[PDB]
Structure formats: C-alpha cells, structure tokens
Design a protein around this ligand. Structure first.
Ligand SMILES: [Ca+2]
Ligand SMILES: [Ca+2]
Lengths: 123, 129
C-alpha cells in the first residue's frame, strides 16, 4: 500500500494538503513529502475523478494546484498589425493550473497566488 | 489628420468602440474601419498611457475588458508541453474560458495593464490605423 497518510490509485499515491502555498513552493514541498513526489498530474479523467473526490472528502470545497506551470509563457504572442513584440505591460507574469474540488475541470490562476494542493508519486 | 471620430497620437489614428465582439470579430471589424486597420497595438509606455486615457474617457459603463491586438497566434489551450513530473500533456479538460490566450485592458488597473483573458468573451475595443 501507499504510506498511511496517502491514498492509492492505479499504482500511484496521492495526498491533499490544506496549507496554502504558491505554485512553485507547493511543487517543491511535494518533492520533499516522498521520493519522486510532485504536484498531482492528471493523465486521465478517471484519475482526476479520484483526486477530486479525495480532495473534497478530506478538505471539502476549495482550490488545489495541479502540476502545470507557466502555461502561456512559451506561446507565440503576436500583434495583429504584425508589429514585433518588444514593449511589455503584462499584469501577471505567469499562470498555473488548478482544480476546484467540485469537479475535474482545469482552471487557471496566477502562479504567485496561494492555493491548497495535492501531491503525487509513483509507488 | 485623422478622420472625424478618431483620435491622433504619434502620427497614428485610434478609435474606441463600445461594441461587444469576440477578439476575432473585433479584429476583423477594425480591418474594415480603415485601410490598414487592426486592433490597437501598444508598443511603448507613451502609447500605453495615451490608450489608457482614451479608453478611460471613451469606453465607460461597459463593465468589461477592452481588447488589444496582442494574442497567441495558435488556439492551443496551453503552450507548456510538460507536467512537473516530466510527462507530456496528452490529456486536457479545460473550461474554455479558463484558457486565457488573449489580452485586454481593465478599469481596475487603469486600462494600463494587459490582463490575460479568454478570446471568446465579447468585449469593447480600440482600433488603430
Ligand atoms: Ca498523474
Ligand atoms: Ca500601435
């Protein structure tokens, strides 16, 4: 089985945390909870369903970080008038992905902000 | 000089529109408002301050964002091909409105900062030629 404080799903172990942290701190914190630990990653709707329910049954309604960061930083941002991108006035520098314990839909939040989270590792 | 209804700045002409359109429709609309027209491009702090004031004074009571011409070319939901565990992203379940690959100005930040927003919203905008 997985460590007593974690839950098992198809060979992997998951564990939700109630202490809020920004994305980076959450990811780093996960690497310290167990060898191979990382923020939870959803490779299927079934895995997402398991984690969403686990998160809700543990801490109820809230938002939890998933392991996807800087989602639009690498995009090819272009001006419609063909002007080259030089000057920048972004309100936020990067967005990260999270889910609300009500359903498995993906949502975005500035990485610098806080949120609960779920860690995962392969047993 | 600029056409009646348009404002001038650094040799270019700008015009605010309190019409609710998706980014695609707004851009197309702008190309048809003037030869060489497009959604506004903000290429310097000076242009940013001018546009912020133009919007503050001409797009009132809309309670919405205001489109600018900068956006992600492709319509991918995200451009980061990798989870923190190293695996690729071959499964996604985004709420469309949560994939914010367009940008708009907002009253809360004085219409001076670019906010990531869903390209599918219907917002007023500014055209430039
Ligand atoms: Ca996973
Ligand atoms: Ca311009």
């Amino acid at each position: 089985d997985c460590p007593s404080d974690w839950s098992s799903y198809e060979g992997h172990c998951y564990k939700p945390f109630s202490e809020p942290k920004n994305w980076a701190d959450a990811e780093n914190f996960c690497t310290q909870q167990h060898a191979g630990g990382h923020l939870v990653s959803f490779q299927s709707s079934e895995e997402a369903d398991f984690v969403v329910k686990l998160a809700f049954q543990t801490f109820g309604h809230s938002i939890f970080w998933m392991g996807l960061s800087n989602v639009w930083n690498q995009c090819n941002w272009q001006w419609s008038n063909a002007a080259m991108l030089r000057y920048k006035a972004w309100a936020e520098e990067s967005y990260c992905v999270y889910f609300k314990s009500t359903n498995n839909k993906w949502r975005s939040r500035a990485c610098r902000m806080m949120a609960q989270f779920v860690c995962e590792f392969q047993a | 000089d600029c056409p009646s209804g348009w404002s001038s700045y650094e040799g270019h002409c700008y015009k605010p529109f309190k019409l609710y359109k998706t980014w695609d429709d707004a851009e197309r609309f702008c190309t048809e408002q003037a030869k060489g027209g497009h959604l506004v491009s903000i290429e310097s702090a000076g242009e940013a301050d001018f546009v912020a004031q133009l919007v503050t004074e001409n797009i009132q009571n809309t309670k919405s964002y205001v489109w600018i011409g900068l956006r992600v070319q492709g319509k991918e939901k995200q451009c980061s091909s990798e989870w923190s565990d190293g695996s690729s992203v071959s499964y996604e379940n985004w709420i469309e409105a949560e994939s914010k690959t367009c940008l708009g100005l907002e009253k809360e930040t004085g219409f001076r900062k670019w906010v990531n927003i869903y390209c599918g919203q219907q917002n007023p905008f500014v055209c430039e030629a």
